[PDB]
Design a protein around this ligand. Structure first.
Ligand SMILES: CC(C)CCNC(=O)[C@@H]1CNC[C@H](CN2CC(=O)N(c3ccccc3Cl)CC2(C)C)C1
Ligand SMILES: *[C@@H]1O[C@H](CO)[C@@H](O)[C@H](O)[C@H]1NC(C)=O
Length: 337
């Protein structure tokens, strides 16, 4: 493990508080893509020019054209990424990828099958997984592992800052460090339950005074690629019940007036109590009683080995700056400023 003296940031754009993405270039000359950085997976993919135009999602995103890249190297083995809320499919390819000014040779998936629901709902074109090789499909090396192999980063860590807001910085990732301009107080760490997955032990979840949730203990996925906080269907039904929340098709709501009356939600992680006020988790876009406001906390059942498990996504990261320590297998939380 070589540690140099470089640091890179990626500027992130915030879309509707649910999608955070920046820019990467692929090939010679670079073909730019908007991608999301997902600690909850470990592959890289962008949609491919070879994606049937009968896939509307492809007609609406940037497509990588190998035949315009003088650095592309063929491989072609099949690939399928089955995420919690949708699937993509295609084949492996190799080329140069610029990310934060760092240039790295990388194997990625050229997706030739991307469903309208949901990809038609995506602002970005692709994903850059920030997880370990233990979660990478097709045994493909992760892009951070590859960057780490170059020995240029100060520390074997990267940090996420998601702003709430929308002219202003949308978000920011620091490869090989953190940006103290974005957090305050001290960091506080937790060791990953295991290596291979950005997940940690969670002691309890309290809704207001009356602590409903996992009084015993549970798992928490720290997930930069997720818009919401998610828990087991079971856990979430009880959580929601105590908020007077009404469960609809894909989300929970409450009469827009009742939003601010909603109590605090805390999550106990290694000693500190991480609390979110209603303003932190409601989409207050009205104050009327005649209108339903949505909650940034979904119900989602994740299977073994990973699940069952809570997910802490953009709803949480927005309040607490997050550093992913690969060297020590821990995750620091600080108060985002
Ligand atoms: C292969 C294996 C590791 C699966 C387990 N990992 C996972 O499911 C990932 C865990 N992090 C979250 C991630 C969210 N996905 C869900 C998804 O639909 N996106 C999405 C989000 C918002 C709008 C539109 C879209 Cl499309 C974003 C995105 C990133 C494609 C799935
Ligand atoms: C895809 O990469 C793997 C991993 O090294 C390799 O064995 C395989 O031969 C590649 N396929 C081709 C056709 O280049």
């Amino acid at each position: 493990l070589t540690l140099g003296n470089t640091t890179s940031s990626v500027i992130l754009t915030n879309y509707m508080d649910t999608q955070y993405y920046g820019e990467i270039g692929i090939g010679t000359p670079p073909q730019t893509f908007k991608v999301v950085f997902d600690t909850g997976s470990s592959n890289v993919w962008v949609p491919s020019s070879k994606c049937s135009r009968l896939y509307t999602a492809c007609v609406y995103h940037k497509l990588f054209d190998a035949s315009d890249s003088s650095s592309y190297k063929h491989n072609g083995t099949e690939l399928t990424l089955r995420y919690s809320t949708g699937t993509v499919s295609g084949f492996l390819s190799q080329d140069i990828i610029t990310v934060g000014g760092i240039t790295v040779t990388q194997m990625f998936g050229e997706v030739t099958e991307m469903p309208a629901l949901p990809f038609m709902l995506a602002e970005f074109d692709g994903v850059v997984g920030m997880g370990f090789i233990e979660q990478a499909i097709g045994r493909v090396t992760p892009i951070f592992d590859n960057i780490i192999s170059q020995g240029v980063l100060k520390e074997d860590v990267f940090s996420f800052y998601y702003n709430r807001d929308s002219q202003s910085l949308g978000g920011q990732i620091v490869l090989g460090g953190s940006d103290p301009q974005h957090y305050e107080g001290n960091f506080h760490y937790i060791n990953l339950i295991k290596t291979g997955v950005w997940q940690i032990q969670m002691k309890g979840v309290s809704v207001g005074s009356s602590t409903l949730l996992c009084e015993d203990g549970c798992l928490a996925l720290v997930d930069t690629g997720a818009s919401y906080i998610s828990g087991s269907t079971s856990s979430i039904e009880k959580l929601m019940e105590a908020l007077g929340a009404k469960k609809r098709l894909f989300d929970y709501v409450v009469k827009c007036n009742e939003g601010p009356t909603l109590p605090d939600i805390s999550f106990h992680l290694g000693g500190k109590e991480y609390t979110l006020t209603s303003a932190d988790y409601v989409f207050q876009e009205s104050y009327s009683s005649k209108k339903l406001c949505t909650l940034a906390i979904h119900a989602m059942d994740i299977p073994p080995p990973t699940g069952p498990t809570w997910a802490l996504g953009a709803t949480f990261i927005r309040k607490f700056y997050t550093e992913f320590d690969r060297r020590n297998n821990r995750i620091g939380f600080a108060l985002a400023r």
